[PDB]
């Protein structure tokens, strides 16, 4: 079935091999689906990013088409740009925008964001999601690792490898997909679910930005899932430090019943987001400036 699956991808990717125009591949990170490198475009000296995914090593091979569906149809300015895809041996390579400021993860684990900064991240994420959700796309992997920055503090949504579509014909999804600590309780419970799962996962990312880590992070993933499934919504460890406006915002995200949870469109009008600073306000958080 692997040689079968390569042949299918071949019909959907761009022809050729980007090794013919890229130099100096350097691995800068990874996920479960594969690795991410920086590369230099030989003729110009421009930097790009390259995601490499081994076809043999996927939980669910069929998700790899997500990368092609989003790249073909669902582009926006708070979303990382995908340029080309190739089949290189047994790997799918995706050549994409290089976000040189790195991932929000490096920030939330090494410094404290203030609320102007938190609100700017949430605004940017929510702008991306309102548009995605309007077109039936659920990201399903919202967390700090999926949010990338430029050198000038602009915020983009990345890693659509786990996304799915919904429609009049297919209004809810059923698959168990995401990162344990960030999964919505309805998704852990295997209830059919929609875009609302991204809003819950966003709330967990707000807890990352306040506390440094998602709830139950000190537990094995399976156990954390049970606790999310069965308990009241998790609390901030640093609850005392946050403003009533941040807490009111967070209470609209971390609502167990998905029909009571706010939508991205609604959230863009919340007063908490009035505190959002410009991209400039994010710049000092980055490793290269700290």
């Amino acid at each position: 079935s692997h040689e079968q699956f390569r042949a299918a991808l071949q019909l959907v990717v761009d022809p050729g091999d980007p090794r013919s125009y890229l130099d100096n591949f350097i691995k800068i990170g990874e996920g479960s689906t594969g690795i991410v490198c920086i590369a230099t475009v030989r003729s110009s000296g421009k930097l790009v990013a390259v995601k490499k995914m081994d076809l043999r090593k996927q939980q669910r091979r069929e998700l790899l088409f997500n990368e092609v569906v989003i790249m073909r149809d669902y582009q926006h300015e708070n979303v990382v740009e995908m340029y080309n895809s190739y089949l290189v041996g047994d790997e799918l390579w995706v050549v994409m925008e290089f976000l040189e400021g790195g991932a929000l993860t490096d920030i939330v684990t090494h410094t404290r964001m203030n609320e102007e900064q938190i609100a700017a991240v949430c605004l940017a994420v929510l702008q991306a999601l309102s548009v995605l959700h309007a077109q039936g796309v659920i990201h399903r992997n919202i967390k700090s690792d999926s949010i990338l920055l430029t050198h000038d503090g602009r915020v983009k949504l990345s890693d659509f490898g786990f996304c799915a579509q919904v429609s009049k014909e297919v209004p809810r999804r059923k698959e168990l997909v995401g990162t344990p600590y960030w999964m919505a309780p309805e998704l852990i419970s295997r209830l059919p679910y929609g875009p609302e799962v991204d809003i819950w996962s966003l709330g967990i990312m707000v807890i990352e930005m306040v506390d440094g880590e998602p709830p139950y992070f000190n537990e094995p993933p399976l156990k954390a899932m049970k606790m999310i499934r069965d308990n009241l919504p998790p609390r901030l460890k640093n609850l005392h430090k946050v403003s009533p406006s941040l807490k009111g915002f967070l209470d609209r995200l971390l609502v167990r019943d998905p029909a009571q949870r706010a939508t991205a469109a609604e959230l863009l009008k919340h007063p908490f987001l009035a505190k959002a600073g410009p991209p400039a306000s994010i710049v000092p958080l980055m490793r290269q400036n700290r």
């Binding site: 996920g31 479960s32 939980q59 992997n141 997909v177 995401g178 990162t179 000190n218």
Partner: peptide, 6 residues
């Protein structure tokens, strides 16, 4: 403390 997907 695993950040990997499922």
């Amino acid at each position: 403390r695993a950040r990997y997907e499922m």
